Design a protein around this motif. Structure first.
Motif, PDB file in Angstrom:
ATOM      1  N   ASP A   1       2.230   4.869 -47.108  1.00 33.42           N
ATOM      2  CA  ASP A   1       2.153   5.043 -48.555  1.00 33.42           C
ATOM      3  C   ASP A   1       2.832   6.331 -48.998  1.00 33.42           C
ATOM      4  O   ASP A   1       3.493   6.360 -50.041  1.00 33.42           O
ATOM      5  CB  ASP A   1       0.699   5.019 -49.015  1.00 33.42           C
ATOM      6  CG  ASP A   1       0.539   4.386 -50.380  1.00 33.42           C
ATOM      7  OD1 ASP A   1       1.467   4.516 -51.205  1.00 33.42           O
ATOM      8  OD2 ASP A   1      -0.511   3.758 -50.630  1.00 33.42           O
TER       9      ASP A   1
ATOM     10  N   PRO B   1      54.044  15.115 -32.914  1.00 38.95           N
ATOM     11  CA  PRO B   1      52.854  14.865 -33.727  1.00 38.95           C
ATOM     12  C   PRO B   1      51.594  15.323 -33.015  1.00 38.95           C
ATOM     13  O   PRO B   1      51.551  15.436 -31.789  1.00 38.95           O
ATOM     14  CB  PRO B   1      52.867  13.348 -33.911  1.00 38.95           C
ATOM     15  CG  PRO B   1      53.509  12.860 -32.682  1.00 38.95           C
ATOM     16  CD  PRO B   1      54.570  13.862 -32.349  1.00 38.95           C
TER      17      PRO B   1
ATOM     18  N   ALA C   1      12.395 -10.978 -42.155  1.00 37.08           N
ATOM     19  CA  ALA C   1      12.778  -9.852 -41.314  1.00 37.08           C
ATOM     20  C   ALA C   1      13.773 -10.274 -40.243  1.00 37.08           C
ATOM     21  O   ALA C   1      14.704  -9.531 -39.928  1.00 37.08           O
ATOM     22  CB  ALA C   1      11.537  -9.226 -40.686  1.00 37.08           C
TER      23      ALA C   1
ATOM     24  N   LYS D   1      43.865   4.579 -30.812  1.00 40.93           N
ATOM     25  CA  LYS D   1      43.990   5.984 -30.442  1.00 40.93           C
ATOM     26  C   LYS D   1      44.419   6.127 -28.991  1.00 40.93           C
ATOM     27  O   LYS D   1      45.300   6.929 -28.674  1.00 40.93           O
ATOM     28  CB  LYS D   1      42.667   6.705 -30.679  1.00 40.93           C
ATOM     29  CG  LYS D   1      42.698   8.170 -30.317  1.00 40.93           C
ATOM     30  CD  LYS D   1      41.424   8.866 -30.733  1.00 40.93           C
ATOM     31  CE  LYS D   1      41.387  10.282 -30.199  1.00 40.93           C
ATOM     32  NZ  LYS D   1      42.487  11.109 -30.761  1.00 40.93           N
TER      33      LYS D   1
ATOM     34  N   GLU E   1       7.221  -2.655 -47.676  1.00 44.74           N
ATOM     35  CA  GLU E   1       5.769  -2.757 -47.593  1.00 44.74           C
ATOM     36  C   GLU E   1       5.233  -2.128 -46.315  1.00 44.74           C
ATOM     37  O   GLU E   1       4.145  -1.543 -46.315  1.00 44.74           O
ATOM     38  CB  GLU E   1       5.338  -4.221 -47.683  1.00 44.74           C
ATOM     39  CG  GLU E   1       5.831  -4.960 -48.922  1.00 44.74           C
ATOM     40  CD  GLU E   1       5.149  -4.509 -50.200  1.00 44.74           C
ATOM     41  OE1 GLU E   1       4.449  -3.476 -50.184  1.00 44.74           O
ATOM     42  OE2 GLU E   1       5.314  -5.196 -51.229  1.00 44.74           O
ATOM     43  N   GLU E   2       5.973  -2.243 -45.213  1.00 47.30           N
ATOM     44  CA  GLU E   2       5.435  -1.813 -43.929  1.00 47.30           C
ATOM     45  C   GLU E   2       5.192  -0.309 -43.899  1.00 47.30           C
ATOM     46  O   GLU E   2       4.161   0.148 -43.393  1.00 47.30           O
ATOM     47  CB  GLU E   2       6.383  -2.225 -42.804  1.00 47.30           C
ATOM     48  CG  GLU E   2       5.992  -1.728 -41.413  1.00 47.30           C
ATOM     49  CD  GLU E   2       4.662  -2.283 -40.941  1.00 47.30           C
ATOM     50  OE1 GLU E   2       4.139  -3.217 -41.584  1.00 47.30           O
ATOM     51  OE2 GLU E   2       4.136  -1.783 -39.924  1.00 47.30           O
TER      52      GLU E   2
ATOM     53  N   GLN F   1      47.218  14.725 -33.131  1.00 43.84           N
ATOM     54  CA  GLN F   1      46.117  13.875 -33.595  1.00 43.84           C
ATOM     55  C   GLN F   1      46.763  12.627 -34.193  1.00 43.84           C
ATOM     56  O   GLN F   1      47.718  12.105 -33.597  1.00 43.84           O
ATOM     57  CB  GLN F   1      45.203  14.676 -34.523  1.00 43.84           C
ATOM     58  CG  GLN F   1      44.217  15.591 -33.816  1.00 43.84           C
ATOM     59  CD  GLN F   1      43.291  14.852 -32.878  1.00 43.84           C
ATOM     60  OE1 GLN F   1      43.619  14.631 -31.716  1.00 43.84           O
ATOM     61  NE2 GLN F   1      42.132  14.454 -33.383  1.00 43.84           N
TER      62      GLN F   1
ATOM     63  N   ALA G   1      15.441  -1.867 -44.721  1.00 42.98           N
ATOM     64  CA  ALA G   1      16.318  -3.028 -44.721  1.00 42.98           C
ATOM     65  C   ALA G   1      15.704  -4.183 -43.946  1.00 42.98           C
ATOM     66  O   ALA G   1      15.707  -5.324 -44.417  1.00 42.98           O
ATOM     67  CB  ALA G   1      17.678  -2.657 -44.134  1.00 42.98           C
ATOM     68  N   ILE G   2      15.162  -3.908 -42.761  1.00 37.49           N
ATOM     69  CA  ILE G   2      14.671  -4.982 -41.904  1.00 37.49           C
ATOM     70  C   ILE G   2      13.221  -5.301 -42.236  1.00 37.49           C
ATOM     71  O   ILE G   2      12.909  -6.406 -42.691  1.00 37.49           O
ATOM     72  CB  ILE G   2      14.821  -4.630 -40.413  1.00 37.49           C
ATOM     73  CG1 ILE G   2      16.268  -4.250 -40.084  1.00 37.49           C
ATOM     74  CG2 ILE G   2      14.367  -5.797 -39.549  1.00 37.49           C
ATOM     75  CD1 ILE G   2      16.430  -3.579 -38.751  1.00 37.49           C
ATOM     76  N   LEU G   3      12.325  -4.337 -42.024  1.00 33.87           N
ATOM     77  CA  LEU G   3      10.901  -4.622 -42.170  1.00 33.87           C
ATOM     78  C   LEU G   3      10.493  -4.697 -43.632  1.00 33.87           C
ATOM     79  O   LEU G   3       9.524  -5.383 -43.975  1.00 33.87           O
ATOM     80  CB  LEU G   3      10.080  -3.560 -41.442  1.00 33.87           C
ATOM     81  CG  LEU G   3      10.028  -3.634 -39.912  1.00 33.87           C
ATOM     82  CD1 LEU G   3       9.058  -2.609 -39.370  1.00 33.87           C
ATOM     83  CD2 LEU G   3       9.639  -5.014 -39.412  1.00 33.87           C
TER      84      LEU G   3
ATOM     85  N   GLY H   1       3.600  -8.563 -45.545  1.00 35.37           N
ATOM     86  CA  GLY H   1       4.466  -8.680 -46.704  1.00 35.37           C
ATOM     87  C   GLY H   1       3.894  -7.914 -47.887  1.00 35.37           C
ATOM     88  O   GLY H   1       3.379  -6.810 -47.728  1.00 35.37           O
TER      89      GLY H   1
ATOM     90  N   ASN I   1      17.108 -10.633 -41.989  1.00 37.20           N
ATOM     91  CA  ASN I   1      17.681  -9.320 -42.258  1.00 37.20           C
ATOM     92  C   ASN I   1      18.196  -8.677 -40.981  1.00 37.20           C
ATOM     93  O   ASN I   1      19.239  -8.017 -40.986  1.00 37.20           O
ATOM     94  CB  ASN I   1      16.644  -8.422 -42.925  1.00 37.20           C
ATOM     95  CG  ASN I   1      16.316  -8.861 -44.331  1.00 37.20           C
ATOM     96  OD1 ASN I   1      17.019  -9.683 -44.914  1.00 37.20           O
ATOM     97  ND2 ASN I   1      15.243  -8.315 -44.886  1.00 37.20           N
ATOM     98  N   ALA I   2      17.474  -8.854 -39.875  1.00 34.46           N
ATOM     99  CA  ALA I   2      17.929  -8.305 -38.604  1.00 34.46           C
ATOM    100  C   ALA I   2      19.224  -8.964 -38.158  1.00 34.46           C
ATOM    101  O   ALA I   2      20.114  -8.294 -37.629  1.00 34.46           O
ATOM    102  CB  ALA I   2      16.848  -8.479 -37.542  1.00 34.46           C
TER     103      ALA I   2
END
Lengths: 234, 285
Positions: free
Chosen positions: A158, A36, B250, B275, A154-155, A38, A149-151, B91, B253-254
């Motif tokens: 623009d 075989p 935050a 492996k 809004e952060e 991989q 996802a975290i902040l 926010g 979420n973290a």
């Protein structure tokens, strides 16, 4: 199919799950006593894929507009079978589990999908510009996934807020109801021509449709359908 | 997917969560000091409001209702006071107040009236500069516990523009402290209508030793100034509360991202060990 190709007939080849060809090769090779390579694959997977794929070629006598389907084991795109399949294609499309779970069921990942004819002088300058700009804005959303996802939204700046909103509206707008998926999506099918798609995405990037909430971009055809839905909802 | 880059990602997100927890607790401390300042400042306005009630009750003549008592007809120019956080990470509070200011400007332009905005805090100033409508007067770098002297620099300018006829009506938009979870914007006027604190419940005729005109001219600027002070201090409390809530979310979420990345790293480690062992076993055979 080769007989019809040799006579000049424009064959459509719809081979399904070439990965299962590779897997059967792996199983029989394991039985055959080959060492075989991989992850338990046959040593001769490259040559087997070459032998099978090179017969799928458009010849001057006649063209085979092939269209394959591939199954990545688990979800590992680095598996040897898809890895060997990739280099034998002209237009690669990659469906992601994450997009599918979000109910964007066409589920095509624009970033990982690409084609050889995405050339300004083969598919049209406007088409090339729209496609590249769509990928750029999307790529930006992929970069900003962690911050969003975290902040939170809004952060970030623009300009980045606008690009992220446009990217979300895009990847929703890639969703489409197919004629064969009526029993799942109650909406009927949509045969969006390429020209209407190019115009719709050019408008979406331009700003036309920025006021529309992103929800209305789900399961719609060309941009006119989104406008009609929004106006119907006032 | 390499089982080592995921470790770096987990470490970084854990650092993010820790710094965010620090932000949350410091912001909670600032929110509590700001609420204490709101309570301490409350009695002054609490007293001036019934003073305005009584004075408005006495002064009924339109001719003698000059200065800030002129309900001028044929409104042309209106001024608005917008108060924003000095820094970000607040926010959606800044988004709310700025959207409120934007719809205010659009509505005023719908009536054909020119608008002018004075910005408290850097974010409002920067937003209005980027929109292309330069604010006339700005007061940035405002302290956590500002003194009324800081707001004078904008208040006196607004009232001077009011008296001279440059501006006809005065409004203020600020992040109202409804609760520690919700801080919505609120519009208020700075053209004393009838001082509806307690209406005209109290009815005692006063002697105006300076005189009616002098009394009104001296007191109305002070009343609008303390109203602006109250709005700014309420907005500071709302800012600190909103930052505290945003940092709490935050951090959560973290931590969720830490769990997800730990699961991915565990899966990567198991795959790497599989492996490893499979390759050495195959080499053995």
């Amino acid at each position: 199919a080769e007989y019809f190709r040799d006579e000049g007939r424009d064959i459509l080849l719809f081979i399904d799950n070439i990965f299962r060809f590779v897997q059967a090769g792996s199983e029989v090779s394991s039985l055959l006593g080959r060492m075989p390579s991989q992850v338990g694959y046959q040593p001769t997977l490259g040559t087997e894929m070459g032998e099978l794929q090179e017969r799928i070629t458009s010849t001057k006598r006649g063209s085979i507009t092939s269209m394959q389907a591939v199954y990545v084991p688990a979800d590992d795109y680095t598996d040897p079978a898809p890895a060997t399949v990739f280099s034998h294609l002209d237009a690669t499309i990659s469906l992601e589990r994450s997009i599918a779970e979000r109910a964007i069921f066409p589920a095509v990942d624009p970033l990982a999908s690409t084609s050889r004819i995405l050339d300004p002088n083969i598919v049209g300058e406007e088409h090339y510009r729209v496609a590249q700009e769509v990928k750029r804005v999307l790529q930006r959303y992929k970069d900003l996934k962690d911050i969003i996802a975290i902040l939170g939204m809004e952060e970030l700046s623009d300009e980045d807020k606008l690009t992220v909103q446009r990217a979300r509206k895009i990847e929703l707008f890639f969703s489409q109801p197919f004629t064969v998926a009526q029993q799942f999506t109650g909406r009927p099918g949509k045969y969006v021509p390429v020209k209407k798609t190019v115009e719709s995405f050019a408008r979406l990037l331009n700003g036309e449709g920025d006021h529309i909430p992103e929800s209305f971009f789900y399961m719609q055809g060309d941009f006119d359908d989104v406008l009609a839905a929004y106006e119907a909802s006032q | 997917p390499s089982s080592r880059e995921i470790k770096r990602r987990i470490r970084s997100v854990k650092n993010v969560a820790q710094i965010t927890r620090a932000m949350e607790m410091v912001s909670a401390s600032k929110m509590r000091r700001a609420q204490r300042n709101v309570l301490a400042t409350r009695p002054y306005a609490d007293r001036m409001r019934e003073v305005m009630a009584n004075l408005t009750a006495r002064v009924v003549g339109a001719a003698r209702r000059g200065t800030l008592l002129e309900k001028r007809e044929t409104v042309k120019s209106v001024a608005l006071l917008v108060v924003t956080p000095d820094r970000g990470l607040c926010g959606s509070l800044v988004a709310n107040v700025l959207r409120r200011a934007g719809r205010f400007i659009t509505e005023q332009r719908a009536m054909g009236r020119t608008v002018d905005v004075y910005t408290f805090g850097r974010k409002g100033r920067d937003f209005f500069l980027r929109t292309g409508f330069a604010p006339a007067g700005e007061a940035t770098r405002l302290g956590d516990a500002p003194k009324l002297e800081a707001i004078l620099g904008v208040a006196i300018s607004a009232i001077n523009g009011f008296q001279s006829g440059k501006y006809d009506e005065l409004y203020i938009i600020y992040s109202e402290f409804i609760n520690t979870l919700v801080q919505r914007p609120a519009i208020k006027q700075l053209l004393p209508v009838e001082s509806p604190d307690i209406s005209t419940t109290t009815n005692v005729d006063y002697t105006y030793e300076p005189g009616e005109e002098e009394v009104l001219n001296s007191i109305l600027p002070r009343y609008v100034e303390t109203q602006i002070y109250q709005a700014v201090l309420e907005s500071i409390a709302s800012e600190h509360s909103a930052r505290m809530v945003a940092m709490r979310n935050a951090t959560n979420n973290a931590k969720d991202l830490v769990r997800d990345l730990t699961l991915s790293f565990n899966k990567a480690r198991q795959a790497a060990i599989t492996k490893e062992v499979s390759e050495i076993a195959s080499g053995a055979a």
